[PDB]
Structures are given as structure tokens and as C-alpha cells.
Design a protein around this nucleic acid. Structure first.
Ligand SMILES: Nc1ncnc2c1ncn2[C@@H]1O[C@H](COP(=O)(O)OP(=O)(O)O)[C@@H](O)[C@H]1O
Ligand SMILES: [Mg+2]
Length: 434
DNA sequence: TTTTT
């Protein structure tokens, strides 16, 4: 509906050039424009996103769940990690007929995921000569929002010598196709609070005086119990503690879903709580996709019935009831063996638990992309990722709806240099690799 | 530290 939305819709549908990017600050309407691209490209297009919450918000699915990529480092063009589907599988028949791939929240898309989408699309359509196999890809997202996640294994050494960085614009595909950049400026999520919107405009460039304005405006440590509030917190275990304190305020019998952890599985890598106490009405979020498709990762809901090795959840999207059973997680580490310059994956331990965690309080990574009614930001040991603070402050429409526990220190205004070179070289309208 | 199955 917006002008820059309508002009970005046209610049993307009216030209047959693949590799477009529609970027802009948070709440400018990228994902809403995607809903319009979906109506334009009905049935011709698949909508993907890197995260489960962002995928549901965009009315699509995660990139891994579509291509069936393993949840590990997708080595460059490596047939052990990236594998094309079967000769007459229904996945194959979807890649072949499709012509548009809409990829939302492109900023959280790690370079190895994008480079795997390229190769996977080349091999299945057997156009190994053409980027993305001839699919017209439409990227949407923001690079000043959260960076892609890199675990401290040899994966970070593999990424740093094959791409030199984890961001999607460091993928080697951009040396074969130029990326066309369309920009949105005027904010729509915060169209009601213009000064909140422009406070957030100067915060995304890191204006320090625009931050002391924030610390005296929106600090209400008591902000965590006004009903209708969603608590954002950086670290997962911090969210566990806040979740349980709200959980003890419900008049139901609790169930303790003890996890069967095994092998060398660290506690810091725990997807959900190990003990995971849950009551008959708790607000949960689902962490794994249903092999039958009635629920997905990132699905918010509330418990209705819970039992020994299963429980039922009312999903908030469709208002329907699902029953979840314990999925099994597994930890992958990358070992340098043999004394050859090739690393190889290994599984060192499993974590069998019900794919559920409480969601009175959520991480910030699972909040990116969402429009929330009311948010309280509880800073634990602090901010550790790039764009993590900007994401937590932009989920609301009015400042009135945002709450801080402590005043932010400029200490927490992280920033990557790879992003500034990108944001500077796309001022021309194009990105082809340096 | 955080995501993805
Ligand atoms: N043209 C528009 N008119 C009215 N509201 C809009 C418009 N575009 C977006 N919005 C609203 O702004 C909110 C944020 O939009 P969203 O698509 O999330 O932007 P982004 O994906 O860039 O964060 C949504 O709740 C939506 O209703
Ligand atoms: Mg969005």
C-alpha cells in the first residue's frame, strides 16, 4: 500500500533480473510487501526464512526444512552436506517448476546457507551454469539487525577461509550475478509514534545521544508483570529463569519433563531446559517441526493437557490443538582429522527432550521479524551479538509499549565492519562482490 | 553467548 512499497513491488516484478534485495530499517514493511509478492507470484513462488519464527511470520518455512539441509556447516558445494532430492520425490517436482524464491530476513542467513541454496538449485534443475539454477530470488531483510550465528568450532575457521565472513553478501554467487538493491525508509510499524520511529532511526546508526534519550524514557524494571507483556532477553538460560518465575504463579499441577541427555552434550548448547517444568496452562513455544505438518518450529501456544511422554498445545496461529512427543536432538562437532586439510562432521552426543520451552519470556533471536503489542527487555549478562539491541527495541509500535530493565550502556552497541562496507557500497543501488 | 534438523 505504501509508496516505497509499491515502487519496490514494481522494481522487482517488472524486471526479469534475478537477485533483488529489498532492504530497510525495522518495521518499514518488508515482510508486508512479501505478502503482496506472494499474491502476485501465486503457486509459482516458495517463501523461506532462516528462522522458524521468521518463517511463520512470512507464511513460509525455514530454508533447512525446504531443502532438507542438515543443521550444521554446509561445506562449499559438498555432496555430503548439500544433497539434491530424489528423481521423482515431491521436493524435486517443486524446485523444478518453481520460478521465484522469496527469502525473508536475509540478514540472519549465514553465507554457507545461501551458498547451499545456490548449489542445491543448480544441481536439481541441472543448470550448473546459472546462479540459483535460474530461479529469480527476492531477498528481504536488514543487515543492521541480527548477524548470522557461528559456533566456535572449526566451522568458524572454515567460514573465515572460504568466504572470509558469515554474512550472506560474502557468498561467491555474487561474483556471477549482481544483486539489485531496493530501499525502504518510512516506518510503518511505528507510524503512530513518529518520534519513537526517528529515535530508532538514529539508534540504528548508533547515535550515542539518541541512546541516553532512550535510557531515561523507557526504563521501568517493574515492566515485567503488566499483563500482555512479552519479555525479550539475550541469553536462553536467562529466559528460563524468568519463564519459571511467571510459571510458579499458576494454580496447576506441574510436570517435570526430564531430558535423557547422553554423550558429550554441553549444558550451554541445551535447546530447551533439561528439567523443563510445565503446568496445565503455561505459554509455550514449539522448537521442532512436525513430520506431518500441523505444527512448526517457532509456534507459540498454551498447554491444555500434559502427560508422561507427551502433551497437547493450542497453537496461536490457527487456534487448533496439536500433541507433541519428545524429539531427539544431537550435537555435531567438526573434527580436523585426518591430518588432511579437510574437516569432517561427528556426532558426540544426543539430547532427547520434548520440543517445548516456556515462552512468557523469549530470546531476541526468536523475536526478530515480529510485531509485538508490548515488550520488556531484560538485560542479563548483556548484549553479545550485532544488531541485537536494535531488534529488541523495534518490536513495538509505541515507545509506551517498550520497557527496559536497566539503562543501556553504549557498551552494548556492537557493530560489524563487514556490514558498513556493504551498507556503503549498496548506496549505489547494486552489490557485486569486492 | 545465538539460529537451523
Ligand atoms: N502500507 C501499510 N499500511 C498500514 N500498515 C502497514 C503497512 N505496511 C506495514 N504495515 C504494518 O506495519 C507492521 C510492520 O510491518 P512489517 O511487514 O513487519 O515490516 P518489516 O517486515 O520490515 O519489519 C505490520 O503490523 C503491518 O500491519
Ligand atoms: Mg519481517
Amino acid at each position: 500500500l505504501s509508496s516505497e512499497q509499491q515502487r519496490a513491488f514494481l522494481a522487482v516484478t517488472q524486471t526479469p533480473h534475478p537477485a533483488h534485495l529489498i532492504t530497510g530499517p525495522a518495521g518499514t514493511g518488508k515482510t508486508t510487501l512479501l505478502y503482496a509478492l506472494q499474491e502476485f507470484y501465486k503457486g509459482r513462488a516458495v517463501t523461506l526464512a532462516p528462522t522458524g519464527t521468521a518463517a511463520l511470520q512470512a507464511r513460509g518455512q525455514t530454508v533447512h526444512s525446504f531443502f532438507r539441509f542438515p543443521a550444521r556447516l554446509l561445506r562449499y558445494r559438498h555432496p555430503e552436506d548439500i544433497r539434491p532430492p530424489g528423481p521423482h520425490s515431491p521436493l524435486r517436482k517443486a524446485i523444478e517448476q518453481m520460478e521465484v524464491l522469496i527469502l525473508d530476513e536475509v540478514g540472519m542467513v549465514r553465507v554457507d546457507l545461501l551458498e547451499a541454496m545456490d548449489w542445491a538449485l543448480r544441481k536439481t534443475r541441472k543448470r550448473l551454469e546459472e546462479p540459483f539454477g535460474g530461479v529469480k530470488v527476492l531477498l528481504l531483510g536488514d543487515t543492521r539487525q541480527l548477524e548470522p550465528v557461528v559456533p566456535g568450532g572449526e566451522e568458524a575457521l572454515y567460514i573465515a577461509r572460504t568466504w572470509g565472513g558469515p554474512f550472506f553478501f560474502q557468498a561467491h554467487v555474487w561474483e556471477e550475478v549482481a544483486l539489485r538493491v531496493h530501499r525502504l525508509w518510512e516506518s510503518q510499524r511505528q507510524r503512530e509514534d513518529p518520534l519513537f520511529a526517528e529515535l530508532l532511526k538514529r539508534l540504528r546508526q548508533g547515535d550515542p545521544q539518541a541512546l541516553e534519550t532512550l535510557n531515561r524514557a523507557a526504563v521501568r524494571p517493574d515492566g515485567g508483570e503488566e499483563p500482555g507483556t512479552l519479555i525479550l532477553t539475550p541469553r536462553r538460560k536467562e529466559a528460563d529463569a524468568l519463564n519459571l518465575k511467571r510459571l510458579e504463579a499458576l494454580p496447576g499441577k506441574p510436570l517435570e519433563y526430564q531430558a535423557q541427555v547422553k554423550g558429550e552434550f554441553a549444558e550451554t548448547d541445551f535447546p530447551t531446559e533439561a528439567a523443563l517444568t510445565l503446568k496445565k496452562g503455561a505459554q509455550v513455544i514449539l522448537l521442532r517441526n512436525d513430520p506431518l505438518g500441523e505444527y512448526f518450529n517457532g509456534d507459540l501456544g498454551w498447554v491444555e493437557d500434559l502427560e508422561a511422554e507427551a502433551l497437547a498445545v493450542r497453537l496461536k496461529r490457527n487456534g487448533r490443538r496439536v500433541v507433541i512427543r519428545p524429539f531427539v536432538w544431537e550435537k555435531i562437532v567438526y573434527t580436523y582429522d585426518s591430518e588432511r586439510e579437510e574437516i569432517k562432521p561427528q556426532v558426540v552426543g544426543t539430547f532427547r527432550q520434548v520440543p517445548v520451552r516456556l515462552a512468557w519470556a523469549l530470546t531476541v533471536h526468536k523475536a526478530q521479524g515480529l510485531t509485538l503489542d508490548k515488550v520488556h527487555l531484560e538485560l542479563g549478562r548483556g548484549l553479545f551479538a550485532h544488531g541485537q539491541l536494535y531488534v529488541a527495541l523495534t518490536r513495538v509500535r509505541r515507545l509506551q509499549d517498550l520497557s527496559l530493565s536497566r539503562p543501556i550502556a553504549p557498551t552494548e552497541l556492537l557493530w560489524r565492519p563487514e556490514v558498513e562496507v556493504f551498507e556503503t557500497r549498496i548506496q549505489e543501488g547494486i552489490w557485486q562482490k569486492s
